[PDB]
Structure 1
Amino acid sequence: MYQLEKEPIVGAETFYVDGAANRETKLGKAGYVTNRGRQKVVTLTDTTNQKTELQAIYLALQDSGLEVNIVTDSQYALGIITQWIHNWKKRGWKTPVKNVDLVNQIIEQLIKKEKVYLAWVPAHKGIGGNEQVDKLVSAGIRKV
């Protein structure tokens, strides 16, 4: 009964989200930079790569208005969220055993929104949005 936008909401502020974790220490960071000049980065413990990407999306929804554009490089986070929206109650749908709690608070947050655009872009270089948030969350977590 909720449906993500097929194209970016024109006018809405865009959040370039990212996360990174290190597998030896389970330390990591999640955060965002936006096209209206606001950024946030938080440090986490006992986390994974997949967890930190979801965490980034969560702060995006946390800190944005009713219409938000979110660009992620995590096809996992996009898929697991999108699969939850689409299988909106099925007597034939088992729920994922991974990150169940995190994916559930995101859903809660996103049900509150009026319009969300969520899109995947591959990790890439340049001086664009995904590139700034990459190195912000990669700081002290991985070499890039």
Structure 2
Amino acid sequence: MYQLEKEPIVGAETFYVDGAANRETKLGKAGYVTNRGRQKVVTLTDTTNQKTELQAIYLALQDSGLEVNIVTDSQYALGIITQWIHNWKKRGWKTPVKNVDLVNQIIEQLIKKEKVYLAWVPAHKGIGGNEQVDKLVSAGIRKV
């Protein structure tokens, strides 16, 4: 229904989102850091790594203005969201089984926006945004 931006929205605040979970305890964290100096980290129970990545995106949509840049390192989160947008009101579309409720909450937030840019980056070493939020969500969840 929607058109995600082809390139970052110049001027808009950028949310570097991430999540991490531990399979053995199902504990996890999801959150963001932004280039305007905000951050947020929430602790979650009964969750998975995929669920935490989606939850971080939901948090960024909840806390942002009408134009938002979001940078994720979850290929899954980006793919399931983009596929939802491209295939609604379209033939031959079976909605995914896993995480359907969370993705529906995200799409809810997405359509309320004016412009959204969503990009995937591989996780990497450094001092940039994806690295910072990685350390935040990995604290006490997985070794780094």
**Deviation of 1:128 (Å):** 0.1
Instruction: Give SS of 2:113's match.
Output: coil
CA distance in structure 2 between the partners assigned to 1:125 and 1:133 by the alignment: 12
Which stretch shifts more, 66-75 or 82-91? 82-91
- The aligned counterpart of 1:61 is 61
**Deviation of 1:92 (Å):** 1.1
**Deviation of 1:101 (Å):** 0.1
Which stretch shifts more, 79-88 or 90-99? 90-99
Which stretch shifts more, 81-90 or 13-22? 81-90
- The aligned counterpart of 1:78 is 78
CA distance in structure 2 between the partners assigned to 1:41 and 1:85 by the alignment: 27
TM-score, structure 1 length as denominator? 0.99
RMSD: 0.5
CA distance in structure 2 between the partners assigned to 1:91 and 1:16 by the alignment: 34
Which stretch shifts more, 88-97 or 64-73? 88-97
TM-score, structure 2 length as denominator? 0.99
Instruction: Give SS of 1:68's match.
Output: strand
**Deviation of 1:140 (Å):** 0.1
| Deviation sequence 1:86-109 (CA, Å, 0-9, x none) | 002123111100000000000000
Q: Which runs of 4+ in 1 moved over 6 A?
A: none
> Is it true that 1:7 corresponds to 2:13 in the alignment?
no
Instruction: Give SS of 1:135's match.
Output: helix
**Deviation of 1:41 (Å):** 0.2
**Deviation of 1:124 (Å):** 0.2
CA distance in structure 2 between the partners assigned to 1:49 and 1:62 by the alignment: 20
Write out aligned runs for 1:25-40 (5 A). 25-40=25-40
| Deviation sequence 1:97-128 (CA, Å, 0-9, x none) | 00000000000000000000000000001000
Instruction: Give SS of 2:16's match.
Output: strand
Write out aligned runs for 1:119-138 (5 A). 119-138=119-138
| Deviation sequence 1:21-76 (CA, Å, 0-9, x none) | 00000000000000000000000000000000000000000000000000000000
| Unmatched 5+ stretches in structure 1 | none
| Unmatched 5+ stretches in structure 2 | none
Aligned residues: 144
CA distance in structure 2 between the partners assigned to 1:33 and 1:27 by the alignment: 21
